[PDB]
Amino acid sequence: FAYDGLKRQRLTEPMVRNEKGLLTHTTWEDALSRVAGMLQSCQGNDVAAIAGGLVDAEALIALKDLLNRVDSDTLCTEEVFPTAGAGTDLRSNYLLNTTIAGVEEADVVLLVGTNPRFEAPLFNARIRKSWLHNDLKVALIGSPVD
Amino acid sequence: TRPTVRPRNDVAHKQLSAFGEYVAEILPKYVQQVQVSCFSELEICIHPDGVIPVLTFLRDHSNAQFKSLADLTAVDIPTRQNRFEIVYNLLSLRFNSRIRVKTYTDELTPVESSVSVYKAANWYEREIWDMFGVFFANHPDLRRILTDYGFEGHPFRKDFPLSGYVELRYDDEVKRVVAEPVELAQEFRKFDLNSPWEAFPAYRQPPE
Amino acid sequence: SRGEYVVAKLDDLINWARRSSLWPMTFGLACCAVEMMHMAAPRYDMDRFGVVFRASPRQSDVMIVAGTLTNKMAPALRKVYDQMPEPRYVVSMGSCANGGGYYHYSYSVVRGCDRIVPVDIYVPGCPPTAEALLYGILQLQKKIKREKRLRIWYRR
Amino acid sequence: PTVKPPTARKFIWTNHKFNLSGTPQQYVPYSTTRKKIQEWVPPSTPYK
Amino acid sequence: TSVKPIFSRDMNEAKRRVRELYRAWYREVPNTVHLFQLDISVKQGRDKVREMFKKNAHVTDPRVVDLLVIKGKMELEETINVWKQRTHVMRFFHETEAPRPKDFLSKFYVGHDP
Amino acid sequence: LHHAVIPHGKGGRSSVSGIVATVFGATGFLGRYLVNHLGRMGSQVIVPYRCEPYDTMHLRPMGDLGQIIFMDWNGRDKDSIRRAVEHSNVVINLVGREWETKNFDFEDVFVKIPQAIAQVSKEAGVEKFIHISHLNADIKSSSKYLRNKAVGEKEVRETFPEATIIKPADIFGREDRFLNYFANIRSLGKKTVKQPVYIVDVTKGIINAIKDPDARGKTFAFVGPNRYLLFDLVQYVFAVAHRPWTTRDKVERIHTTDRTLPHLPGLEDLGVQATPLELKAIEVLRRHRTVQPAKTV
Amino acid sequence: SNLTLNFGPQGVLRLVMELSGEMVRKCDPHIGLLHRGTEKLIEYKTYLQALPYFDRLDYVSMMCNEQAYSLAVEKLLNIQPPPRAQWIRVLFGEITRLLNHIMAVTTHALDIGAMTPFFWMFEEREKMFEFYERVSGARMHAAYVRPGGVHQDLPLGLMDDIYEFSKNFSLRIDELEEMLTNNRIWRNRTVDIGVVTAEDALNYGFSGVMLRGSGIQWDLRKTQPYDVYDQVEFDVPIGSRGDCYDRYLCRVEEMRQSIRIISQCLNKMPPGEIKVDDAKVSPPKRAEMKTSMESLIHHFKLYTEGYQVPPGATYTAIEAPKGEFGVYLVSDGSSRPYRCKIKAPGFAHLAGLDKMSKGHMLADVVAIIGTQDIVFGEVDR
Amino acid sequence: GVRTSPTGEKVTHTGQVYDDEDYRRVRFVGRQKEVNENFAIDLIAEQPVSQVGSRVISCDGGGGALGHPRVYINLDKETKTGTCGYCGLQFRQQH
Amino acid sequence: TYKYVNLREPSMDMKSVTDRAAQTLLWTELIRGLGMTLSYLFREPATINYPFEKGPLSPRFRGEHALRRYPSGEERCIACKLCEAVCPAQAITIEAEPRADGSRRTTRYDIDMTKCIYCGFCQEACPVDAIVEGPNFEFSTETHEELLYNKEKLLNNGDKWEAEIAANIQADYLYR
Ligand SMILES: CCCCCCCCCCCCCCCCCC(=O)OC[C@H](COP(=O)(O)OCCN)OC(=O)CCCCCCCCCCCCCCCCC
Ligand SMILES: NC(=O)C1=CN([C@@H]2O[C@H](COP(=O)(O)OP(=O)(O)OC[C@H]3O[C@@H](n4cnc5c(N)ncnc54)[C@H](OP(=O)(O)O)[C@@H]3O)[C@@H](O)[C@H]2O)C=CC1
Ligand code: SF4
Ligand code: SF4
Ligand code: SF4
Ligand SMILES: [Zn+2]
């Protein structure tokens, strides 16, 4: 039911700041020229990048190649994952390594610090299906959420 | 099942089954299948090398005497490696009967032209060149008959869109009807009308 | 002024003579030709309006496009339209001539004859009745009646 | 209709009109639906 | 993988047919510019025939170039016999069409089409 | 930018081009091919017409459904001009006469009408205005045409400061009055030098001046690629057309040489390759038939 | 050398003539000028939706082509119409036959020069179009004969008017036949013109009068009979010389025998329903659509999806007035056709135009294009 | 019950009216915007709530076979009327 | 069951040969054709005086489209989209939403009358008799887009023509 936010508040035209500091409509040549004029004056840690929650892999590697052409490695996300130790070098310590389906094979689940009902609702539904049909033993470390 | 159900004609069914046995055993070199539908219509499915020997048999044999070529048809079925299915509808006036002769080709194998047998085909399979792209070898005048002269592609192929790729309009700069890429003011609205429940258990195909 | 009155009466005279003596060139493309022939038939009888039956294209006043305009015949339509002397008019008759109709999404159909020739009167139907085609021809005559060639010429 | 009159309604036109094609009262087509995709209206204050 | 041929047995007979078809088109182009009273030069029509022959130059199948020679013969028959009009001849010259964007940047500017 | 005027499609007939154009004088020689080239992009073209609507019929196949809106206008009435320009984002002015009439002289056509159109389009919020003058326009010129056209150029530049003024020299096409004037005259040869520009190049230049934001406030000179003397030009027209109504002002404008203006940009700065006379003069003059090309300077 | 003419499109037809003075050495009909791609548009539309395309193929034989397509779909559905719908189909099929033969004879006389029986017989044709408008609401393209029967029952008092028409129509045939049959100018334009042998007529795929003018005793209403043609009594006219004059006489006699059939159908119309009483094929009544739940579901699903036709291929041919009109319908099990080839007689007749106009003259070409009743809608599809 | 935008352009029963800065009003310049002046949402609000003495009412829109499919409406809510889903008429149990 | 047209042998006695020669030399059947044309000269012609006289029609006639209302002003159309589903030309385009009182109604109901084939499947598919193809056939236009009806034009056609549409449906609905 969130598809009707997809037709409200949409950014449909390129916007640049005028002399009053107000966002005004413009073409793609003007907007991309005013961005590339600042990108050509940057180098090193002069330019950074933050990705959001809804970003595809193609644009992620597009912006990573572009900010490596300026030699900028400050490429950040918003959701903080700890880089102490292996970090993101090995894929095992940031995946759901078992599977969503592997909950059907489990007998004990320890849910640490999470509310899987509202973070991953169908993962919670798969835990409940294992709870019902396979008699899964679930323990939660965290706040007593329903 | 008296008022609303079409009555079965078992006499013509048994007669067309006997004549299908007859054609299948006189010509085993080309006849691959023989089938009779539930509404008593006979189909002889042959190999494309035997277009001229089968059609001259049914035209000339005294038990067949299929003198008239009613219709000549291709059917595009893209899930086959021989996607085109050439259909000959034949009428015997002596025995008051109709027979269907069916063969096959892909885009590149030519089919032998049956203008030696039935001259009626001189336009019909010519139409099959214009609509499907099936070449017919040893045809006297094979060219397009229904589409426009500079038309590229073959329209009744099922990988060809409903509209074309080009549309015509008069342009006043060049003082000429010109062709441009097709742009509709309203798209043809594809409807998905197939019911997801099985209608006919008799035609059920076995699964894998 | 006097000259305005003179050119107004002369416009009324030449508009009377051009609408009361329309000669049609009828494209018998498709089923609308049958209903044009019924508009020429003794019931509706175009000839009593001064609208003669099957004049030649090089002396006709109105091109009635009656039937589907395919891609193969669109240059022939424009060529016959170009051979018509002025003032020439075009009546579009039925849905295929109007906008493509039942063959609008076809690969081989011009989607309306107004992609080819300038159209004055759009008569809708599939086919429009012969009485409806005659209504369209009388509306064409009324359009000719309110032309202002000599009034605008005197004002230019 | 003098003998068998039509059944009267509050919405049937009391004043019939003829064919108006060629007049300033003629029909002009238009889309009868509202705007689908709402745009982001940028704020009227400066960004400082 | 053994198929029935159309006219040619290998690629050399097919190149013979392509060569004779190109010869017939090269002879026909001045008559085509003359009797259709086209506004193009004879050199420009010959460049269009060269472009339409080199468009299909990558084909390495004898049956496909057989059907291409057959369709070029049909187009030449519709050109010699005056069956085409001036419009059908000039549809090879896409004059009234806009120039299509070629680079990435102008295609980015005009729309979504790759 | 409003949502209904964002360009969509592939630039064909049923696409949206984002141009809402009001072409004054579209029922003439330049307005014909301009409404043609605008309508093949999918532009909302507004055609104000003075003439009988019959004389607008050829403008009706030029666009998609609802794309050309015909409306009446008087050249002395600012109200109909405001009624025609109050929705447009570009206003092109193509109003002109080769001769003066009883109701309209050169001052009524070249001075008052462009000032009225440009002023009313200035007070209506129109972004782009395009005025069409002649290359040989001059205040002290011998012909009343070029005098009043230079005065109208000055007035348009001072009442619409961002207006694009365009100088074609002597336009040739199928419906022209330059090659067809020479082919039917059956005046003489003098020391007059002419470079004629082709009408599709003029139309492509007008449209590339609509699309370019850097063409605002410029003055362009649309000239062909070859300057010809008058005598051998006229003899080449008689050579192509297979041959052995006027005013004195037209004679003054044929024997007036086309000035070279290097300080004004041309068709090569709007992306338009100028089409020479030797490619299109046969297309113009094949009508007049019951060839050595002309020497330049 | 020899002359080559191009009688262009100034239906419509392009003709490339190779002449040898007055003679005709080669006749090449360039067609496709009304090719609209009907039988590709049929593939994306349901069976009810593909029905009105058949009205517009032979656009002077509308309810006949409706009947042929309806018989094809009902054959693939294994259902049959009620008897009253069958008698209505045969009745309006013979009224359609009168329409087509009036069009044929009067335009064949109009092109040769006899322009008067055109006007005389189109008043009768106007009255039969009033019969179509009374039965269906449209004067030409009725969309009336549907798979399952017909769309709607006859309005009260229609059969009395079909009686009053049929009582007087034989005098109209008689005054047409007075103007043309014994006329020496009409005989001089049609007797030695386009003689077709019976073996070449069978070989060229000719059908109808084009066979029966050459003495072949073949009519599909007798030999391969459909709805109630085995229950009506009529005669089949047979020619003797295979020319334009025998085909003219065959069409006049088929008007006579159609009047005979219409008299028998008026006297033998049974009571009953007019659709098949399977509401999974033909839609229910509007009074029971608005009351019954099953009937509303069946109304919804027939006017949105349509009936599913079982998978199979059929060639259903009827005797249209131009000859054997056939529909080769291929169904894949869905509610839309997979394929619909439309056999029309004018295609094979116009293919045989080149043999029929050998050794004749240029003004005999218009007589041969008249004796083959060629409507280019059915030729080009 | 029509209303009017500040542009002077009439508002339809949908609520559609072109914006002030929208070029597509140029099609109404010199011509008229054809709106219907009998808004059905205003005309159905003038109808009286029918007081009936049953728990379930039926509606066919009047005319029998000339109306809509016949539907049954439950009238258990005294807070609210039971509106016919087709014709918009509304009913109430009188107790 | 068959008859031979044109298989008569002419007689060869002197009587019938002289009859055929008198027919040749005295042009007797040509005088017969002149007599038939002279007979139609003295008949009343079949010509009605249009526009003042109209050709006869039936209540089933399929002319210009209109959207009907209930006898309370509420429009009959409830956006079920059966009429654009069955439309063989795809001339109907419908868009809908619930309006301010919750009723299932259309915001767009367009019929391209230049696409329309006038076969009346929309009026017979409509379960509430909303869209009808009424009696009007005299609605020729001078412009192509005037034959592209939106919902407002069709509702004005219904308000214009309801006094006749309701009587035609009253005369015909028992056959439906
Ligand atoms: C200085 C002042 C004078 C200026 C010069 C003018 C001198 C006089 C010229 C002739 C008359 C000019 C006026 C013409 C008619 C103007 C009014 C008009 O058009 O009325 C229309 C009316 C018919 O009305 P309508 O719309 O057709 O209705 C159909 C009914 N179902 O029409 C009618 O009722 C009949 C119209 C008849 C028109 C007049 C007759 C024709 C012209 C005759 C003279 C010229 C031709 C001479 C012969 C030519 C060669 C044979
Ligand atoms: N050789 C050339 O073509 C050149 C032309 N130009 C300029 O380009 C412009 C267009 O050229 P061109 O097409 O040849 O000219 P046209 O004469 O062919 O077209 C002029 C247009 O303006 C209209 N018009 C003329 N006078 C008036 C008036 N008084 N009031 C209202 N409308 C009027 C005409 O309509 P109507 O039919 O009603 O008269 C027509 O639509 C002109 O300004 C011309 O000076 C510049 C350089 C060269
Ligand atoms: S609008 Fe329809 S009935 Fe008319 S000619 Fe076209 S297909 Fe035939
Ligand atoms: S009459 Fe037929 S084509 Fe016209 S809108 Fe109704 S269903 Fe569609
Ligand atoms: S007009 Fe009738 S069929 Fe069409 S959407 Fe409205 S209620 Fe349904
Ligand atoms: Zn209700």
Side-chain angles (χ1 to χ4, degrees), chain D residues 5-23:
Chain D
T7 308
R9 295 283 184 262
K10 67 178 74 176
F11 58 91
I12 295 175
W13 287 358
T14 61
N15 196 358
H16 177 79
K17 292 185 285 184
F18 52 86
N19 192 2
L20 294 170
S21 178
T23 62

PDB file of all heavy atoms in Angstrom, chain D residues 5-23:
ATOM      1  N   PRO D   5     -47.037  11.927 -24.747  1.00  0.00           N
ATOM      2  CA  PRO D   5     -45.889  12.771 -24.406  1.00  0.00           C
ATOM      3  C   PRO D   5     -44.794  11.963 -23.736  1.00  0.00           C
ATOM      4  O   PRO D   5     -45.066  10.916 -23.132  1.00  0.00           O
ATOM      5  CB  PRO D   5     -46.488  13.800 -23.433  1.00  0.00           C
ATOM      6  CG  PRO D   5     -47.942  13.760 -23.679  1.00  0.00           C
ATOM      7  CD  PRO D   5     -48.241  12.338 -24.013  1.00  0.00           C
ATOM      8  N   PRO D   6     -43.545  12.410 -23.823  1.00  0.00           N
ATOM      9  CA  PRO D   6     -42.466  11.716 -23.118  1.00  0.00           C
ATOM     10  C   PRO D   6     -42.549  11.938 -21.617  1.00  0.00           C
ATOM     11  O   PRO D   6     -43.118  12.917 -21.130  1.00  0.00           O
ATOM     12  CB  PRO D   6     -41.200  12.349 -23.698  1.00  0.00           C
ATOM     13  CG  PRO D   6     -41.633  13.701 -24.136  1.00  0.00           C
ATOM     14  CD  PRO D   6     -43.037  13.538 -24.625  1.00  0.00           C
ATOM     15  N   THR D   7     -41.962  10.999 -20.880  1.00  0.00           N
ATOM     16  CA  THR D   7     -41.961  11.067 -19.425  1.00  0.00           C
ATOM     17  C   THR D   7     -40.976  12.137 -18.975  1.00  0.00           C
ATOM     18  O   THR D   7     -39.778  12.042 -19.256  1.00  0.00           O
ATOM     19  CB  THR D   7     -41.592   9.711 -18.835  1.00  0.00           C
ATOM     20  OG1 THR D   7     -42.440   8.705 -19.398  1.00  0.00           O
ATOM     21  CG2 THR D   7     -41.803   9.724 -17.344  1.00  0.00           C
ATOM     22  N   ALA D   8     -41.475  13.154 -18.279  1.00  0.00           N
ATOM     23  CA  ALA D   8     -40.672  14.330 -17.983  1.00  0.00           C
ATOM     24  C   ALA D   8     -39.697  14.062 -16.846  1.00  0.00           C
ATOM     25  O   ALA D   8     -39.987  13.293 -15.927  1.00  0.00           O
ATOM     26  CB  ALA D   8     -41.572  15.512 -17.628  1.00  0.00           C
ATOM     27  N   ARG D   9     -38.536  14.710 -16.916  1.00  0.00           N
ATOM     28  CA  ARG D   9     -37.488  14.601 -15.913  1.00  0.00           C
ATOM     29  C   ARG D   9     -36.944  15.986 -15.594  1.00  0.00           C
ATOM     30  O   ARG D   9     -37.056  16.919 -16.391  1.00  0.00           O
ATOM     31  CB  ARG D   9     -36.340  13.712 -16.390  1.00  0.00           C
ATOM     32  CG  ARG D   9     -36.686  12.255 -16.617  1.00  0.00           C
ATOM     33  CD  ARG D   9     -36.773  11.507 -15.316  1.00  0.00           C
ATOM     34  NE  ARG D   9     -37.002  10.085 -15.533  1.00  0.00           N
ATOM     35  CZ  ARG D   9     -38.199   9.517 -15.470  1.00  0.00           C
ATOM     36  NH1 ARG D   9     -39.260  10.251 -15.166  1.00  0.00           N
ATOM     37  NH2 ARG D   9     -38.336   8.216 -15.679  1.00  0.00           N
ATOM     38  N   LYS D  10     -36.324  16.108 -14.419  1.00  0.00           N
ATOM     39  CA  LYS D  10     -35.744  17.384 -14.019  1.00  0.00           C
ATOM     40  C   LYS D  10     -34.457  17.698 -14.767  1.00  0.00           C
ATOM     41  O   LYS D  10     -34.010  18.850 -14.743  1.00  0.00           O
ATOM     42  CB  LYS D  10     -35.473  17.394 -12.517  1.00  0.00           C
ATOM     43  CG  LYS D  10     -34.392  16.422 -12.083  1.00  0.00           C
ATOM     44  CD  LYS D  10     -34.125  16.519 -10.593  1.00  0.00           C
ATOM     45  CE  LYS D  10     -35.247  15.884  -9.792  1.00  0.00           C
ATOM     46  NZ  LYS D  10     -34.958  15.895  -8.334  1.00  0.00           N
ATOM     47  N   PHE D  11     -33.851  16.709 -15.428  1.00  0.00           N
ATOM     48  CA  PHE D  11     -32.565  16.885 -16.086  1.00  0.00           C
ATOM     49  C   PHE D  11     -32.639  16.939 -17.604  1.00  0.00           C
ATOM     50  O   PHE D  11     -31.658  17.349 -18.229  1.00  0.00           O
ATOM     51  CB  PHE D  11     -31.591  15.773 -15.660  1.00  0.00           C
ATOM     52  CG  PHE D  11     -32.075  14.372 -15.941  1.00  0.00           C
ATOM     53  CD1 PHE D  11     -31.782  13.743 -17.142  1.00  0.00           C
ATOM     54  CD2 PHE D  11     -32.784  13.665 -14.984  1.00  0.00           C
ATOM     55  CE1 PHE D  11     -32.217  12.457 -17.396  1.00  0.00           C
ATOM     56  CE2 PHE D  11     -33.215  12.377 -15.234  1.00  0.00           C
ATOM     57  CZ  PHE D  11     -32.930  11.773 -16.441  1.00  0.00           C
ATOM     58  N   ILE D  12     -33.755  16.514 -18.204  1.00  0.00           N
ATOM     59  CA  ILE D  12     -33.931  16.620 -19.647  1.00  0.00           C
ATOM     60  C   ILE D  12     -33.976  18.089 -20.043  1.00  0.00           C
ATOM     61  O   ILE D  12     -34.569  18.918 -19.342  1.00  0.00           O
ATOM     62  CB  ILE D  12     -35.203  15.864 -20.075  1.00  0.00           C
ATOM     63  CG1 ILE D  12     -35.052  14.373 -19.801  1.00  0.00           C
ATOM     64  CG2 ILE D  12     -35.518  16.049 -21.546  1.00  0.00           C
ATOM     65  CD1 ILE D  12     -36.311  13.583 -20.073  1.00  0.00           C
ATOM     66  N   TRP D  13     -33.289  18.423 -21.140  1.00  0.00           N
ATOM     67  CA  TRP D  13     -33.172  19.804 -21.593  1.00  0.00           C
ATOM     68  C   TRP D  13     -34.524  20.393 -21.958  1.00  0.00           C
ATOM     69  O   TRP D  13     -35.263  19.837 -22.773  1.00  0.00           O
ATOM     70  CB  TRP D  13     -32.245  19.898 -22.802  1.00  0.00           C
ATOM     71  CG  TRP D  13     -30.803  19.725 -22.498  1.00  0.00           C
ATOM     72  CD1 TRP D  13     -30.242  19.527 -21.279  1.00  0.00           C
ATOM     73  CD2 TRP D  13     -29.723  19.795 -23.434  1.00  0.00           C
ATOM     74  NE1 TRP D  13     -28.879  19.439 -21.396  1.00  0.00           N
ATOM     75  CE2 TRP D  13     -28.535  19.600 -22.710  1.00  0.00           C
ATOM     76  CE3 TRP D  13     -29.647  19.987 -24.816  1.00  0.00           C
ATOM     77  CZ2 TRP D  13     -27.286  19.598 -23.317  1.00  0.00           C
ATOM     78  CZ3 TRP D  13     -28.409  19.984 -25.415  1.00  0.00           C
ATOM     79  CH2 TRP D  13     -27.245  19.786 -24.669  1.00  0.00           C
ATOM     80  N   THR D  14     -34.843  21.529 -21.337  1.00  0.00           N
ATOM     81  CA  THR D  14     -36.027  22.279 -21.722  1.00  0.00           C
ATOM     82  C   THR D  14     -35.816  23.037 -23.020  1.00  0.00           C
ATOM     83  O   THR D  14     -36.794  23.479 -23.629  1.00  0.00           O
ATOM     84  CB  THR D  14     -36.422  23.258 -20.615  1.00  0.00           C
ATOM     85  OG1 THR D  14     -35.360  24.194 -20.398  1.00  0.00           O
ATOM     86  CG2 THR D  14     -36.705  22.510 -19.330  1.00  0.00           C
ATOM     87  N   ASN D  15     -34.571  23.195 -23.457  1.00  0.00           N
ATOM     88  CA  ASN D  15     -34.256  23.939 -24.671  1.00  0.00           C
ATOM     89  C   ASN D  15     -33.325  23.077 -25.521  1.00  0.00           C
ATOM     90  O   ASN D  15     -32.123  23.002 -25.255  1.00  0.00           O
ATOM     91  CB  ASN D  15     -33.631  25.286 -24.334  1.00  0.00           C
ATOM     92  CG  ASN D  15     -33.643  26.245 -25.502  1.00  0.00           C
ATOM     93  OD1 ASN D  15     -34.093  25.909 -26.593  1.00  0.00           O
ATOM     94  ND2 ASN D  15     -33.166  27.459 -25.271  1.00  0.00           N
ATOM     95  N   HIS D  16     -33.897  22.419 -26.527  1.00  0.00           N
ATOM     96  CA  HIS D  16     -33.125  21.656 -27.498  1.00  0.00           C
ATOM     97  C   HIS D  16     -32.228  22.583 -28.311  1.00  0.00           C
ATOM     98  O   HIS D  16     -32.579  23.730 -28.595  1.00  0.00           O
ATOM     99  CB  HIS D  16     -34.076  20.901 -28.428  1.00  0.00           C
ATOM    100  CG  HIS D  16     -33.393  20.126 -29.509  1.00  0.00           C
ATOM    101  ND1 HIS D  16     -32.806  18.900 -29.293  1.00  0.00           N
ATOM    102  CD2 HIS D  16     -33.202  20.409 -30.819  1.00  0.00           C
ATOM    103  CE1 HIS D  16     -32.290  18.456 -30.424  1.00  0.00           C
ATOM    104  NE2 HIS D  16     -32.511  19.356 -31.364  1.00  0.00           N
ATOM    105  N   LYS D  17     -31.055  22.080 -28.674  1.00  0.00           N
ATOM    106  CA  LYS D  17     -30.110  22.817 -29.494  1.00  0.00           C
ATOM    107  C   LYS D  17     -29.771  22.007 -30.736  1.00  0.00           C
ATOM    108  O   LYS D  17     -29.777  20.775 -30.712  1.00  0.00           O
ATOM    109  CB  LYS D  17     -28.843  23.152 -28.705  1.00  0.00           C
ATOM    110  CG  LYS D  17     -29.079  24.163 -27.597  1.00  0.00           C
ATOM    111  CD  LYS D  17     -27.791  24.571 -26.913  1.00  0.00           C
ATOM    112  CE  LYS D  17     -27.295  23.473 -25.999  1.00  0.00           C
ATOM    113  NZ  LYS D  17     -26.089  23.893 -25.242  1.00  0.00           N
ATOM    114  N   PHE D  18     -29.483  22.704 -31.826  1.00  0.00           N
ATOM    115  CA  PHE D  18     -29.161  22.043 -33.083  1.00  0.00           C
ATOM    116  C   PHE D  18     -27.673  21.687 -33.122  1.00  0.00           C
ATOM    117  O   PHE D  18     -26.956  21.789 -32.124  1.00  0.00           O
ATOM    118  CB  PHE D  18     -29.611  22.908 -34.264  1.00  0.00           C
ATOM    119  CG  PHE D  18     -29.112  24.327 -34.226  1.00  0.00           C
ATOM    120  CD1 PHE D  18     -27.870  24.658 -34.741  1.00  0.00           C
ATOM    121  CD2 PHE D  18     -29.898  25.335 -33.693  1.00  0.00           C
ATOM    122  CE1 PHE D  18     -27.412  25.959 -34.707  1.00  0.00           C
ATOM    123  CE2 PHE D  18     -29.449  26.640 -33.662  1.00  0.00           C
ATOM    124  CZ  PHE D  18     -28.204  26.949 -34.169  1.00  0.00           C
ATOM    125  N   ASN D  19     -27.202  21.234 -34.284  1.00  0.00           N
ATOM    126  CA  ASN D  19     -25.796  20.890 -34.464  1.00  0.00           C
ATOM    127  C   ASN D  19     -24.960  22.162 -34.473  1.00  0.00           C
ATOM    128  O   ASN D  19     -25.173  23.048 -35.304  1.00  0.00           O
ATOM    129  CB  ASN D  19     -25.612  20.115 -35.765  1.00  0.00           C
ATOM    130  CG  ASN D  19     -24.244  19.471 -35.890  1.00  0.00           C
ATOM    131  OD1 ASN D  19     -23.412  19.550 -34.993  1.00  0.00           O
ATOM    132  ND2 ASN D  19     -24.006  18.835 -37.023  1.00  0.00           N
ATOM    133  N   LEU D  20     -23.998  22.245 -33.557  1.00  0.00           N
ATOM    134  CA  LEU D  20     -23.266  23.478 -33.307  1.00  0.00           C
ATOM    135  C   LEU D  20     -21.851  23.444 -33.868  1.00  0.00           C
ATOM    136  O   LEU D  20     -21.026  24.280 -33.497  1.00  0.00           O
ATOM    137  CB  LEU D  20     -23.238  23.763 -31.807  1.00  0.00           C
ATOM    138  CG  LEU D  20     -24.592  24.076 -31.170  1.00  0.00           C
ATOM    139  CD1 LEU D  20     -24.490  24.088 -29.660  1.00  0.00           C
ATOM    140  CD2 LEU D  20     -25.109  25.409 -31.676  1.00  0.00           C
ATOM    141  N   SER D  21     -21.556  22.512 -34.768  1.00  0.00           N
ATOM    142  CA  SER D  21     -20.221  22.426 -35.341  1.00  0.00           C
ATOM    143  C   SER D  21     -19.998  23.542 -36.352  1.00  0.00           C
ATOM    144  O   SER D  21     -20.741  23.667 -37.328  1.00  0.00           O
ATOM    145  CB  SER D  21     -20.013  21.070 -36.003  1.00  0.00           C
ATOM    146  OG  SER D  21     -18.730  21.002 -36.594  1.00  0.00           O
ATOM    147  N   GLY D  22     -18.963  24.344 -36.118  1.00  0.00           N
ATOM    148  CA  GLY D  22     -18.695  25.519 -36.919  1.00  0.00           C
ATOM    149  C   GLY D  22     -19.040  26.826 -36.246  1.00  0.00           C
ATOM    150  O   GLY D  22     -18.917  27.881 -36.879  1.00  0.00           O
ATOM    151  N   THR D  23     -19.469  26.786 -34.995  1.00  0.00           N
ATOM    152  CA  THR D  23     -19.903  27.929 -34.213  1.00  0.00           C
ATOM    153  C   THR D  23     -18.993  28.074 -33.000  1.00  0.00           C
ATOM    154  O   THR D  23     -18.251  27.145 -32.665  1.00  0.00           O
ATOM    155  CB  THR D  23     -21.365  27.743 -33.770  1.00  0.00           C
ATOM    156  OG1 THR D  23     -21.471  26.586 -32.937  1.00  0.00           O
ATOM    157  CG2 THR D  23     -22.269  27.568 -34.974  1.00  0.00           C
TER     158      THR D  23
END
